[PDB]
Design an enzyme around this catalytic site. Structure first.
Site, PDB file in Angstrom:
ATOM      1  N   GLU A 181       0.828  -1.250   0.000  1.00  0.00           N
ATOM      2  CA  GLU A 181       0.000   0.000   0.000  1.00  0.00           C
ATOM      3  C   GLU A 181       0.850   1.283   0.000  1.00  0.00           C
ATOM      4  O   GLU A 181       0.700   2.164   0.907  1.00  0.00           O
ATOM      5  CB  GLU A 181      -1.000   0.001   1.173  1.00  0.00           C
ATOM      6  CG  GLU A 181      -1.901  -1.251   1.074  1.00  0.00           C
ATOM      7  CD  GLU A 181      -3.108  -1.219   2.024  1.00  0.00           C
ATOM      8  OE1 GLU A 181      -3.201  -0.338   2.939  1.00  0.00           O
ATOM      9  OE2 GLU A 181      -3.996  -2.110   1.864  1.00  0.00           O
TER      10      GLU A 181
HETATM   11 CL   LIG Z   1      -1.547   1.923  -2.351  1.00  0.00          CL
END
Ligand SMILES: [Cl-]
Ligand SMILES: [Ca+2]
Length: 512
Positions: A181
């Site tokens: 992420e």
């Molecule tokens: Cl991301």
């Protein structure tokens, strides 16, 4: 009592189902017979392989501590051994017979200690952090230097290959992920990488780390960019350089694929093997996002319909993604279209997802549909993430229905075949065989109605006559997979079975 017609044709649309779609992040009950496990998520960005320390970031007090030792079941003595979080994780994969996907750090630093919260002025670089270097360019040590300011990622990969062999071997660690992420680094890990990640920055970091990994183990699969969700797929969460690099690309997904393909050209080796996203539905029902809490009847209905956003051109969920970005839905064919065009041959993985309702029949039925959908939409790997701690009874039921429906680890087949239903709202159905079988046919069928049973009329096309069937199921009364009444008469390869509301069955048909 309504009748649905279901047509199953074992000759038609045969497609391999990757076993790694039966995958998880946290282990669940332990009898789901998973095929893939991931060591990933927010704690892995700042995980230091040398001392097993990591930082929770915004999930908990920006705290550096031994959580991954605790969570992995290591003793305090084992927590002192270099690599122990990862080697304990992989030993368990070897025991269970699963793929291991292990996250490597890219945000730039890892936890130097386990001394708790890191304040804003103690952001990296500081005494709380070691710097990450991709390539040691010095002799590797199986006992890394614990007292310098560095962790070397290729030295960690060398350590794993030394212990287990290469990814191309039976015991080797097969997959590495390029952090986790990255478009949320500035939000989740502000003490590590407080600036919003750039699009070109992300590519450059990814190329550097991939090359260092591939130099140790050319057969390892590299997964990236591990995007948190649609905002990142679209423009890397408003990356500051997006307008300057976007050119004629439709979204960040394409820019990344094309850039990793171009860098792989220059380098003369594939640097991206699997395009890796997280997908937590934004689908709403009864005013509640399905991933947030079980909700009311409208939440529960929306949860069972939400898997249609993965595949169904006709379905429009209630979410900001469908409201403002419907041209990118359904999401699995859109992702596959991009991957196939901008970096041909790259596979697709959904390495975190959850439909919520973990201990509700709605969550079990959503997952029974999702596992069938992933299998027949060319998804290579998929890993559930537990949004609720403790047991997730109905999610486990969904996995067991596909992978241990009888208590003996009997499974759905490895080959998807065509299964169509006349009512895509109240029912879903998935069919499979193994090794082109004409002797055994597997059908997973479900009723999403809260109110109304249906009589399912099955018409089967096969090379042999099916003569009988056994049935296993779960429902609102019992999350355990229970044997249901058998199918004793099948005439002309057609049979009818009643599916009560909120019930999922696995039917196994045999020619005798
Ligand atoms: Cl991301
Ligand atoms: Ca060191």
């Amino acid at each position: 009592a309504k009748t649905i017609t279901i047509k199953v044709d074992t000759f038609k649309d045969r497609k391999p189902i990757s076993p790694y779609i039966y995958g998880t992040n946290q282990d669940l009950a332990g009898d789901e017979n998973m095929a893939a496990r991931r060591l990933g998520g927010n704690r892995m960005t700042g995980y230091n392989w040398e001392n097993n320390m990591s930082n929770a970031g915004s999930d908990w007090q920006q705290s550096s501590d031994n959580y991954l030792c605790s969570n992995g079941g290591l003793t305090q003595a084992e927590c002192e051994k270099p690599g122990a979080v990862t080697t304990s994780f992989h030993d368990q994969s070897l025991k269970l017979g699963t793929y291991s996907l292990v996250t490597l750090p890219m945000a730039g630093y890892v936890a130097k200690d386990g001394n708790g919260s890191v304040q804003e002025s103690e952001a990296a670089p500081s005494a709380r952090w070691n710097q990450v270097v991709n390539a040691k360019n010095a002799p590797f040590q199986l006992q890394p230097d614990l007292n310098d300011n560095y962790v070397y990622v290729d030295e960690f990969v060398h350590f794993l290959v030394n212990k287990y062999g290469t990814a191309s071997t039976k015991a080797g660690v097969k997959g590495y992920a390029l952090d986790n992420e990255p478009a949320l680094w500035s939000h989740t890990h502000p003490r590590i990488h407080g600036e919003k990640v750039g699009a070109k920055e992300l590519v450059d970091r990814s190329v550097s780390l991939s090359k260092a990994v591939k130099a140790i183990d050319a057969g390892a699969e590299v997964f990236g960019p591990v995007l948190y969700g649609f905002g990142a797929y679209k423009d890397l969460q408003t990356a500051p350089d997006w307008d300057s690099v976007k050119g004629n690309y439709s979204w960040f997904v394409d820019y990344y694929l094309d850039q990793m393909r171009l860098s792989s050209q220059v380098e003369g080796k594939r640097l991206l093997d699997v395009f890796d996203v997280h997908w937590y539905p934004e689908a709403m029902g009864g005013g509640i996002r399905i991933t947030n809490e079980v909700g009311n009847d409208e939440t529960k209905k929306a949860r069972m319909q939400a898997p249609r956003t993965l595949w169904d051109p006709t379905y429009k969920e209630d979410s900001w993604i469908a409201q403002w970005n419907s041209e990118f839905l359904p999401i699995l064919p859109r992702l596959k279209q991009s991957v196939d065009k901008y970096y041909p041959g790259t596979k697709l993985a959904m390495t975190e997802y959850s439909y919520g309702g973990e201990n509700d029949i709605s969550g079990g039925i959503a997952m029974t549909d999702v596992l069938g959908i992933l299998g027949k939409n060319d998804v290579y790997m998929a890993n559930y993430w537990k949004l609720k701690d403790g047991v997730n009874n109905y999610v486990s039921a969904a996995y067991k229905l596909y992978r241990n429906y009888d208590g003996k680890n009997s499974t759905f087949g490895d080959t998807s075949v065509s299964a169509q239903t006349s009512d895509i709202v109240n029912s879903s159905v998935h069919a499979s065989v193994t090794n082109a079988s004409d002797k055994e046919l597997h059908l997973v069928v479900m009723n999403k109605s809260m109110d109304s049973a249906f009589d399912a009329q099955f018409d089967l096309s096969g090379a042999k006559t099916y003569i009988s069937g056994k049935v296993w199921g779960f429902d609102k009364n019992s999350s355990q997979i229970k044997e249901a009444a058998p199918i004793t008469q099948i005439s002309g390869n057609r049979f009818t079975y009643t599916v009560p509301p909120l019930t999922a069955y696995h039917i196994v048909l045999t020619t005798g």
